[PDB]
Amino acid sequence: NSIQIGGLFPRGADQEYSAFRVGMVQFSTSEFRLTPHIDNLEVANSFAVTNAFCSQFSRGVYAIFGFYDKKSVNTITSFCGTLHVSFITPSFPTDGTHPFVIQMRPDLKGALLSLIEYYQWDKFAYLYDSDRGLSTLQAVLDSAAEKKWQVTAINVGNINNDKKDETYRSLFQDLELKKERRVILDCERDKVNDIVDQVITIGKHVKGYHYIIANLGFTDGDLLKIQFGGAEVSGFQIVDYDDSLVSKFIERWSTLEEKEYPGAHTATIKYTSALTYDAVQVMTEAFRNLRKQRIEISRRGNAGDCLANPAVPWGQGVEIERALKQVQVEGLSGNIKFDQNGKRINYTINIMELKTNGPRKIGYWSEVDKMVLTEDDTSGLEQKTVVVTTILESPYVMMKKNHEMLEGNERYEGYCVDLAAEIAKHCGFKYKLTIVGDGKYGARDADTKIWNGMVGELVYGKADIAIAPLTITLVREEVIDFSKPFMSLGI
């Protein structure tokens, strides 16, 4: 059953079309085959989108797969909601709940709100690009108003190429006026690779700055530039290279010839191509389940003008979309589920931070569950809160009256408490205030030399330091050491 479909592809989406050609024969042919008529045409001109859509409807196909631009989303929704033709896409998700659209890209916005709330920012800059749309820009301003944030949002996308070396210099020097430190980028990969190079030229990647990339292929762009900088760069991934089928596709993908499939003989892959691959899995699961339920899709006639007045559609496409919304397989993004509208739920997004060795994950974020860090505590050097022993003596070390409600190093008060804070301020270490157990100053035992008290805590390696009323004698210098004396007294 070679079933007629239609495909829309931009002039330059060569990696994506090659991944579609791979996924075409990656799994098929125990059954029905596909008849893809490919349209390597533009996406900006909605008249061209109209011509291609009426051409493929003149063909009379059952389903159309491809991309759309923000100047075409209204046209695609307006034709598909009329003519009941199910349309599937990997592009940016739509704003309104529209029928007959399945969209392969998950949400980013709740993830990005989770990331900002995890880092606990208050004031930042937001460089956005207009031509991807403004839904995230609308979403962050509401929570910025509620969560008392201070956003300086800046449009950057309409800047031409021929002034594109000094516009960024004026832009970041205006950011130097408020002395910005925290930048969220929201662009395509080309604008990211343009803006990272201009940052690394004007010298803004030292320790102190902090960058969040709002894309899905965090490692799909260049990261060898600002890897060794000093700035810290975080982003998101939906394609995790650790997994079994992922690494299988990596080995399958690397061994292909570049000449037959352009952009294929690399290690990594674009997330757009990954979703294009999973789209074939969904689309074949559809016609699989319709032969499971044995429902015939016989058109039984020709199609005609797309301008038919009034045009009348066929509701077996409604049943096609109904069976599309029930597809649940595993793919490169993980599990998939759909809503009542065609939007994706049941996804998982990995949080990816850049380190010196390279990228690494620190946690995941689900469709309902918030940010769960994976407890990756590779911090090998923790400055230990050192052991400070003392004893209760007025006014050297005294209890407070409200010690149960307070905690720890706040509970004690006196001369020695004030002194130890000065020592730790001058020396930069961490400390915890402890008490000697046996309640003594300490002397040695007869015939066994067992120093008890505050002496043996330092002799026997128990306590680390002792700021306390201790008297320099002759018999104490042999086992512990003393500084210069700080307060004189007598019997």
Ligand X SMILES: NS(=O)(=O)c1cc2c(cc1Cl)N[C@H]([C@H]1C[C@H]3C=C[C@@H]1C3)NS2(=O)=O
| CA nearest to 307, candidates 6, 8, 50 | 50
Q: Is 82 in the site for a copy of itself (CB under 8 A)?
A: yes
Paired tokens of 55: 């051409």
- Shortest distance, position 175 Cβ to ligand X, whole Å: 51
Q: Is 303 in the site for a copy of itself (CB under 8 A)?
A: no
359 belongs to an annotated ligand binding site? no
- Shortest distance, position 489 Cβ to ligand X, whole Å: 7
The CA–CA distances, whole Å, from 196 to 107, 215, 355, 491 equal 25, 14, 17, 72
Work out the angle between the directed axes of helices 167-175 and 189-202 (0-180°, nearest 10). Answer: 70
**Binding partner of residue 162 among ligand X, a copy of itself, none, CB under 5 to 8 Å per kind?**
none
- Shortest distance, position 227 Cβ to a copy of itself, whole Å: 9
**Strand residue runs (E) in 209-288:** 210-213, 232-237
Q: Is 356 in the site for a copy of itself (CB under 8 A)?
A: no
Q: How many residues bind a copy of itself (CB under 8 A)?
A: 44
Q: How many residues bind ligand X (CB under 6 A)?
A: 5
d(CA 89, CA 294): 26
Residues 233-262, interacting with a copy of itself (CB under 8 A): none
State whether residue 392 is helix, strand or coil: coil
Q: Is 200 in the site for a copy of itself (CB under 8 A)?
A: yes
Paired tokens of 393: 């003596």
**Binding partner of residue 142 among a copy of itself, ligand X, none, CB under 5 to 8 Å per kind?**
a copy of itself
Q: What is the largest CA-CA distance in the chain?
A: 116
Residues 430-489, interacting with ligand X (CB under 6 A): 484-488
State whether residue 23 is helix, strand or coil: helix
| CA nearest to 299, candidates 76, 99, 63, 87 | 63
469 belongs to an annotated ligand binding site? yes
State whether residue 354 is helix, strand or coil: strand
Q: Is 41 in the site for a copy of itself (CB under 8 A)?
A: no
CB-wise, 381 or 487, nearer to ligand X?
Answer: 487
| CA nearest to 369, candidates 170, 54, 111, 179 | 111
| CA nearest to 220, candidates 276, 269, 253 | 269
Residue whose pair of structure tokens reads 């009329």 in the numeric block: 82
CB-wise, 202 or 472, nearer to a copy of itself?
Answer: 202
Residue window 141-180: x/- pattern of binding to a copy of itself, with contact defined by CB under 8 A = xx-xxx-x---xxxx-------------x----x--xx--
**Binding partner of residue 490 among a copy of itself, ligand X, none, CB under 5 to 8 Å per kind?**
none
Asked if residue 395 has a cis previous peptide bond (ω within 30° of 0), the answer is yes
Binding-site sequence positions for L-glutamate: 469, 471, 476
Binding-site sequence positions: 469, 471, 476
Residues that bind a copy of itself (CB under 8 A): 45-47, 50-51, 54-55, 71-72, 74-75, 78-79, 81-82, 130, 134, 138, 141-142, 144-146, 148, 152-155, 169, 174, 177-178, 200-203, 205-206, 225, 228-230, 307, 309
Residues that bind ligand X (CB under 6 A): 484-488
